[PDB]
């Protein structure tokens, strides 16, 4: 199908696959030859009692089987090359566009889901399609050869096995299709009953509150009867596969033997020949069963790969040309802005009109649980501006190249991630360049992480173990403020709540904060009164419709939603 | 192992596994018999040229394979019985004690995680251990047969295979242990690197701000290279698994043939016998690879069983047998209460001397994240009384058990899980018993469920899809208040935050509240603005020290954290 959309991502490796095929064919070649050894064994060897060949057989079997091995060795190792390399390029592009997809892919889908997707689906594509080639080629080496085996030994028994191969293969395809059907149509009710039990368990809370234990026991019981019965049918039918197959398959043997009379009535065969024939037939029965499942495996793989491609074929954050940005801007403004964090149910914000000029410290007071961080996250333009504009010193949203834009903002939230690295360089995500070690380490110490730098393991370049070891929320917050001291955003913002208070820590923190905000705006998530009033100014968060522009210095004289932020909302 | 702990849960089905055994032993009998049948063909059939047996035998093949079939039929279906029955009983007890873990114990795992645990671990236990018995019995039977087969043929090659088969077994056990070791060590570092990439993902926003797409791509690349390499090593070894084994088996075949030449110096065999020998040997080569991984397989099963039994071997919620609970008003009054919602994740509450007399309406305002519901939900003792008891009408909570207590109180929250029944009954999960369908349905529609229950599919006794829960949060709360109206627990507590709902729906819900708050106690999660005061009594709490709350009169009397809240902070 869509191997096209894959072949490039295989192409510059294709040579490897080729290698595979070669030995792979040899592999099943070995198979045939082993069986071939029967011919000299039985008729030529024991019939003529030529103890000569009885010295061939041992050694040649050993050798051939070693060939089977060394093939399997290299087949596996080489398909491992290509599979790994395919996984590699796949996860690479996926990584890339992932870091290109807007916050949606993290909004609509959860991290665990994506990571499962990467690892499982990539390696599934690889594994599946690979094994597809493996079987396919393994079947080619086996079937085709075994027919040639028959050929030299007996035109007749061959002819018959050939004319019958359609019958058996068709029967296999038939039963497989039947029982795919029976195993597909189930999934609906399968998920039905499973998810039913799921809701049961999710509701045990309300259950026990309402004292329905006796009821939900019986409900569990009934749905579990449904469960076990479903399982019964599933395994029953799907297990009828092998019998009927080998049943109808066995008939083959019958005809062969049934019609083995006449050609031995022609005295065509001798014992060894016959043994080779029937052996070979069974050998054939391994890959015949395989082949239908082969097409199945293509389907599984390429399906998951289409899931992939969709995740790729999703579109990154779109930009329209906005290059006009440096590291000193000063003011931000919100005209008539709307956003929708959810799908459509709860409007996030609406016709937001805000104005944070230089130095205007701000603390988010308003609709508790309106995702106040969103407004900051809107300054990040993490979302697309459904209406209005962010006039950041006279220029609109779209006169703002995303690169320098997001470079020009700093956020120190409560919960900060880092990466497994020298914590110093983790501060230095800003290319670790254009900020020298003196700058980095000194300022970082100067930025009040000193008990987290000099006292921690290895002091100056304290390294991370398992991504920050056990660094407190406060540790990471300090580290981010140190980043701010390093990056020195033209506009500096952060988020601190009522989590914890170590006097020196947050005191020197807020000191550095007002250092940053010197003639520079700032926002902080407001749940602490201490952070609210230790700085100068405090704002509204007008409950979805923020027409209000300004802090205490502005929203004090107006007597706006400060009524609610005094008595009814905060 | 823990079979001691599981056998009884199988005992009353013994006969199943017994039929399993007899059938499977027949399966091996069929295997062996066909292989035996191979002889008369070769020695008598074509050697002595007796078309008689050329006619007899083919039919025998058909028959024997029919036996294979029907046996696999019954084997599968019988193991299906026992497996399903085991799954059933297991899931049943797991439901039972799964109704015993405290709500935390419910959230100590994720709901989905426990559901996976039920479904998977149950069917894993069965499937695994069952197939273990399958392998043991069948494969052992095939071995024993094939040895007997050899015996009817030749003392000699038998003896030699008996000397050698242990060595084969040794090689297999050896390589399996080596590569289990390698796989475990990998698994460790595997988790390391995979979780590393996981974190790398989970922190987009940080990077997209700090603009390090290059840095990620590089780190992604390195860790993914590690990934491909681990893949390489894993598949490499696990693939070397087979060929060495088959090489050793090859060595077997070889020395078999050497000591076939030597009793050919004795003129040992005839063609048929010869063909039977090695054929049988390979037939054996399937089940040895079986048996080793067999003694492996229990562990997977029995491991997940231990997981299960532990989930059983948690303690159902403690009880006090105090009982003596009025189905009447009583008086709800916190005293000295100091608890914690999680194990220790976050500090919750301290010294709660809260008094709510009979009929005193209360709201829940303040620390957004103080588990205001958890106060109510702990009137239900969702956790234990860590310190400080609630004197229920002169009786501590500890002075009484949970049974009627939890029945004696109601809680109309925002999100009431419903269940797959005639939703008319869904109101009365506990003991639909003489409760007049007139009374039930009226009170429901009397309780302003009428907005939709009048207009739901089939009218009075409607169900819907998804367990009859297709209703919105609005109809959810509606029917919940209706439930309160059915049980009419003279103890009344509710939970509505009218910050979020439609206007007309809100009109209906407030009217219904009026219809239900007749002289009755009341609490409400107050993230609301207006309906906080429709009942004229509003209050607030932070800091987890609830000594002061209650009516508006009590709001006026706080003069501590809470008066300061409703006058400056909430």
Residue numbers in the entry:
A (entry chain A), B (entry chain B): 11 to 580
What did the published study say regarding this structure?
When the peptidisc peptide is mixed with detergent-solubilized membrane protein and the detergent is removed, multiple copies of the peptide associate with the transmembrane domain, embedding the protein in a peptidisc, which can also incorporate lipids that may be bound to the membrane proteins. In addition, we show that peptidisc-stabilized membrane proteins (in this case reconstituted with the conventional ‘on-beads’ method) can be used for high-resolution structure determination by single-particle cryo-EM. Notably, the arrangements of the peptidisc peptides around MsbA and MscS are very different, revealing the structural basis for how the peptidisc scaffold can adapt to membrane proteins of different sizes, shapes and symmetries.
The slight mobility of the NBDs in the nucleotide-free state is the likely reason for the somewhat limited resolution of our maps as well as the previously published cryo-EM map of MsbA in nanodiscs (also 4.2 Å). The final model was obtained by docking the cryo-EM structure of MsbA in nanodiscs into our 4.2 Å density map using Chimera, followed by refinement in PHENIX. However, unlike the EM map of nanodisc-stabilized MsbA, in which the nanodisc is seen as a large amorphous density, the EM map of peptidisc-stabilized MsbA shows clear tubular densities surrounding the transmembrane domain of MsbA that represent the α-helical peptidisc peptides. Most segments run almost parallel to the membrane plane, with tilt angles of less than ~15° for 8 and 14 segments for the maps of conformations 1 and 2, respectively. In the case of MsbA, the protein in peptidiscs has a higher ATPase activity than in detergent, as was seen for the protein in nanodiscs, and it does not adopt the artifactual conformation with widely separated NBDs observed with detergent-solubilized protein.
